[PDB]
Amino acid sequence: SMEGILDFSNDLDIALLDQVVSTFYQGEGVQQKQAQEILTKFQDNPDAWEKVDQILQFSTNPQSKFIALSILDKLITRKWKLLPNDHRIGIRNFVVGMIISMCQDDEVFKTQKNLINKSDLTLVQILKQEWPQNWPEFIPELIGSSSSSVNVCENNMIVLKLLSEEVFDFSAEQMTQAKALHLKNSMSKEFEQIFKLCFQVLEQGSSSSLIVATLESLLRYLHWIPYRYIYETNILELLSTKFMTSPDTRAITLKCLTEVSNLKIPQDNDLIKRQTVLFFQNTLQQIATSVMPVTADLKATYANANGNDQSFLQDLAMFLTTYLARNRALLESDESLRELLLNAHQYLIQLSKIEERELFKTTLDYWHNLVADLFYEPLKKHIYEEICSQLRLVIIENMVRPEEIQLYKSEREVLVYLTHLNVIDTEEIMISKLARQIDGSEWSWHNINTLSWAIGSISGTMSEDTEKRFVVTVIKDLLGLCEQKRGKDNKAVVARDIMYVVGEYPRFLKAHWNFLRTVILKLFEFMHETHEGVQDMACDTFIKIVQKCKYHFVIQQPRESEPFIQTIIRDIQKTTADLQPQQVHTFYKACGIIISEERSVAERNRLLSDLMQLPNMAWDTIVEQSTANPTLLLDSETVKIIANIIKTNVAVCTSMGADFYPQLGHIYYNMLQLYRAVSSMISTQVAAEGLIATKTPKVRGLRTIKKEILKLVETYISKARNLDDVVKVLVEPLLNAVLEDYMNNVPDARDAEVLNCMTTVVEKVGHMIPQGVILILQSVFECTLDMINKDFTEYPEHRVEFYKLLKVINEKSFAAFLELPPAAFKLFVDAICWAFKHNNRDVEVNGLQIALDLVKNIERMGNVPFANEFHKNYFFIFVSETFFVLTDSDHKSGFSKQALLLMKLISLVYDNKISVPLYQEAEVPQGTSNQVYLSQYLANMLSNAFPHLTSEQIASFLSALTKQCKDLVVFKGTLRDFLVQIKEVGGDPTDYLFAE
Amino acid sequence: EDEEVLYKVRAKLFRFDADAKEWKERGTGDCKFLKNKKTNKVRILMRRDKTLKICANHIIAPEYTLKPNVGSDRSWVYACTADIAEGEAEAFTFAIRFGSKENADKFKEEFEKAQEINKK
Amino acid sequence: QVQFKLVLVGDGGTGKTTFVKRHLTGEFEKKYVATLGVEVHPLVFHTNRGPIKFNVWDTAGLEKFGGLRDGYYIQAQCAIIMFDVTSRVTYKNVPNWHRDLVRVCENIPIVLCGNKVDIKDRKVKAKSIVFHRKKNLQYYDISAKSNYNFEKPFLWLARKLIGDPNLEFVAMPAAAPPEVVMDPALAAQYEHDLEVAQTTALPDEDDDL
């Protein structure tokens, strides 16, 4: 029976609506759900708004009235201007009447805040439509009605707050530029009278709820009003004294004073500088006397989380950091302001100790600003010595692991600056923290890890001599800590921290060969420790030291018989015998970094030969047995060995790039034969078992081999220096091995890595292989488009790699698209428009870029018959496809490139850069300029797509668009104006004449 | 606790949804074989990382058989007649997946040992 | 047991429904099925201070499926605002969701959640995420997919609503499970169902578990 209300042929039963609403808000499971659907269909009924005044009058349920106002809001924001003036005045008067009535009843004002606030927002929606042009007395009457009652005055502060937010804070996306400027100037014109009211309420005092609402509206005003309303009245004094003393007003006052600190203010005026100092002094004095002294444990207070303490302390942090970042120079050169300056910073030190990651980041941004200043600004650091000393301890006790990149970076930068300012104080804190790890008083895994990260972070800041004594001290202490500790858990924790610290001090390692050698041999010993995390940290530390000290492994060190890289390679089997495959790959990668330092070719090739010895021998025995008998691949264990051989080649190619070529040359032929053999096995496995085969460990193993082969080739070609060998030796066998295999597999067996590999090939050597690019298009274009053109979800990897491949082919070898038969070229245009319609931002942005590049490619051809046929066939498809994704609200992330593409297409016609008529003859007089025809075509297209727009709105929009097709920012402004106007009826056509 | 931990391994548990003909994850965390010190009965007890909510709670019945999944070399599927993770004892087709083939084989070995203890 | 209404808001496709479903059933839904208006689900946690129940109002982020919009926020006691760190527009819209929420719910604990931190190519960088500071919102990086910080929003809201900062999620004791006898009449039934399940692949076979 609930579905009664959806029957609009019968008058609405208010008692039934009130039941539905109650069922939705207070009911459960199936009952709630059904009410939900009925309420939604009611609210979305386009005539439902006619029921609102009946519901507001006769409903008992404040939830019904709320939903009634939602319905009214949809009317007011979308279709208001269809209503006769009499009806608009009727609705306006009903809304004002309902607000005043609810405010005059003390019980309803207390208990119905939801409904009153929603009523106030509905009124503001009407002001946006009607005010001031059709309601000049609104502000005078609001000011007047405010003296009649404390409830009405308080509610009028909420209305003015919402009005200010809608006009200055949220207008950007929601109104045309012209309408935003109109409402801003209107509020600006009448502000003097609004301020007079707000000032009187703040002066004449009494009701805390009234005072709080007025300060809430002031916070919004401070975003836009001129400084003189703050600095040339008593208001600064009231905010910084009276309103900081009482806790009801304290939170909002602090947020007001934060925005006061952000006001645009004259820079060269002693009275203003004194007033800026005075409100800070008054605020901090009220904090110290009414809230907590400078010494208070805010860590403890915050933790205890009593009442609004957490928000108050967040707001204090925001106020101090904002004010001091702008004004601390006001406090620095006057002896009588020194205590105020240091107390404000002392509050920040206490706030910095609170355990609350996001608050800590706020204070850390301020400390970064301060210590950066003390590093460069003359005669300042001495002021802040005691503050800086405390901050050293705070940052060191709070150091996070380098894995948390943004927070580690910020913390490191602050600690580096503080170390420069006093290296002795930094060292003393770190050594005495280390001593409290050793004596057990502060011992824990977290605490020794934190300290190790802090010690690591300041590498390179001390003099080489100071660093030498500091690093030795720290390593001796950590070694003692290790010995002293019992059980492998504890020893492994300290051992990881020793590895971490040594890895962060390359300058020390590069100066002390004996030390470096010992470190490496110790890392090799730890590569035999199966205790969790030790092997990974030994491998990570090995590659990190190699990245930084590689030159020391490639020269003969005094009193060594050979370059240390030879010693590593000779013992590689033994060194790596207990590592997991991924650890072996890291190790070989690190060896590749060292070998790339050797600039003698014969010596580099020999070291590369020696490094690849074990994978090359495993490979040779497999290729012998595998070719002698193909069935040997089916073996699970062989597939894993082959994959790990190819992965070892990828690891070493990653670090060696162009230098890897002789190794690639050694395996290339047999690697491509393996690619074909593994392909056949996948094909015949999918035939034998069905698509399910592609989920099996065997077929996933075989496919891994194919993907690592493609990754090896793409890695080499992306870094190759000799492109002649790439084209002459690598490309032809690669294309023969991979393209037909991709084309002739069922969609579910096609590797998207093939597309990725071809992208790199076209990127690096596309200009030199025009026939190769055609072969790539012929093999992958239509079969990949057919996988991805049924929906936006299937084959996400293929989708992304497909548009990256078309993008690079369109940039590098556009001749490949000229070669396509017309039907295939049409599919290319279809594929680009398909990319436009994607929500996934990777595809959409490549889609729009290909479209730009394609237009550029056609423009370049000048006045010839391919270009002329392209425009006649596709210009209007690109204009209308672009407009579709601009106006449908489902593609807002692509806005900028949609606008750029549309501007390009419009400028081609506006400049007369299209030789032929775009219209087919007898559609317009034969003289007709393409400009006149484009105007007409767009007028017609926009009228059909948006029938609620007037002819005038569309003509004005298109007039503005064609004039502004050389000025992107203004063009984008006009497009945004149009996107606001399509969402409502009766948009002003003069809005498109907006300037400046 | 009234129970002894015989075996503990990190695992991901799935239940088969016959309607949607798809596996749905039920939780990730420590799968525990717990021997009740009063009855000597061994159960699987599995709790989710961070929430610690129970995702498996059933006796390792002697009538259960661990079967391979076509997709995995580190997973077992078995029918369970009476699991009380979500309350009222329900039947599920479970799949449990481990970090490695070795963990999965060790799990199978321990599950058989528990079946033999539960035959007593 | 105390029950609190929790409203979940944010752009379409940010992971609101996926996150709640993970909390209800443990499952990771890969498909995007846009919410129509709101889905309401009870969610219970066990704490050292007894059970807490959230009545979760998981609202539609897509404008065309918005339903009652702010109608869903009425008498909410807490909220999560969700965005996707892989989609800049979703963070740009956070102030709009916050505006609409606090106009109905003036004084409630709110968590801001940047979802999908599991994705390598992050578009909303840590440095850019500052909107929470002046609004007194708690912020967490989360992944519904990797379970990174997946409990943190609820733990923080529970601490705020119970008013005990040291509240923890606890394990409830696990009842001894029943010993049953396999029914010989449904033995044929179960071999069928086990056949279908052995021959359907487990998802995400490349994950750590």
Ligand SMILES: O=C(O)c1ccc(N2CCN(c3cccc(Cl)c3)CC2)c(NS(=O)(=O)c2cccc(F)c2)c1
């Ligand atoms: O004088 C040298 O040439 C020398 C050579 C190697 C040294 N190390 C560095 C490697 N090392 C180490 C030990 C365990 C793990 C790790 Cl990653 C590294 C401690 C021994 C040290 N370490 S040390 O702290 O400076 C030192 C000084 C004096 C006596 C020592 F026993 C140790 C010195």
Ligand SMILES: Nc1nc2c(ncn2[C@@H]2O[C@H](COP(=O)(O)OP(=O)(O)OP(=O)(O)O)[C@@H](O)[C@H]2O)c(=O)[nH]1
């Ligand atoms: N990679 C990744 N994907 C996620 C994550 N969370 C959710 N997703 C996916 O992203 C999409 C999110 O879908 P939903 O959770 O339905 O989105 P929603 O926010 O409820 O959207 P609306 O209901 O339309 O407002 C689904 O495809 C999820 O599988 C995450 O942490 N990581």
Ligand SMILES: [Cl-]
């Ligand atoms: Cl300054």
Ligand SMILES: [Cl-]
């Ligand atoms: Cl060097």
Ligand SMILES: [Cl-]
């Ligand atoms: Cl409309």
Ligand SMILES: [Mg+2]
């Ligand atoms: Mg949803």
